[PDB]
């Protein structure tokens, strides 16, 4: 029983974090390197789901 949230949440988090060059977010940047392990599995699940040319 956990479900979708508004789409303006991911946008707000990533627009905040930006390029991680501010000092407020320094506790999170370690976790960013930790998500490098699962980046090829993010790119695979991306490119499986390209829109076909008959879509917008």
């Amino acid at each position: 029983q956990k479900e979708d949230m508004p789409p303006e949440h991911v946008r707000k988090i990533i627009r905040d974090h930006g390029d991680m060059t501010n000092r407020k977010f320094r506790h999170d940047k370690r976790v960013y390197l930790g998500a490098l392990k699962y980046m090829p599995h993010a790119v695979l699940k991306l490119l499986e789901n390209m829109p076909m040319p008959w879509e917008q």
Partner: protein, 138 residues
């Protein structure tokens, strides 16, 4: 604005469209403004607040007031102007002044419990002006 259903939507969408345009403009302002001073997570409370009020506007416009028909209500949900999920927790009994869906998820919380936004204030201790760290306040 993206509509993603090519529908030429039904009636009366023309009387809710300036309202929903105002809420979308305020959501862009509440999405774009900087995060300096706003501490870490109070800079993400207002998107939950205006999402709550947008879903509540369509909510009390349809179930309570019975102005909008069913088809335009399902349209406003299926486009994106409401939650399909949060009205389903507003329809249930004990809770329809709800904050958002993060104070129901009992494993977002570490102790396996629901957040203290969702505690009857009459039966909490008298003066502590706690604001939920997820959703924003009670």
């Amino acid at each position: 604005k993206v509509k993603r259903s090519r529908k030429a939507p039904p009636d009366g969408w023309e009387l809710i469209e300036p309202t929903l345009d105002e809420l979308d403009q305020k959501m862009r302002e509440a999405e774009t403004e900087p995060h300096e001073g706003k501490r870490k997570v109070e800079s993400l409370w207002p998107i939950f607040r205006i999402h709550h009020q947008k879903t509540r506007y369509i909510f009390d416009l349809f179930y309570k007031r019975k102005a909008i028909s069913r088809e335009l209500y399902e349209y406003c949900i299926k486009e994106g102007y409401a939650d399909k999920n949060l009205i389903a927790k507003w329809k249930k009994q004990g809770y329809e002044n709800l904050c958002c869906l993060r104070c129901i998820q009992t494993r977002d919380t570490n102790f396996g419990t629901n957040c203290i936004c969702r505690v009857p204030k009459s039966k909490l201790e008298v003066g502590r002006i706690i604001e939920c760290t997820h959703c924003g306040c009670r």
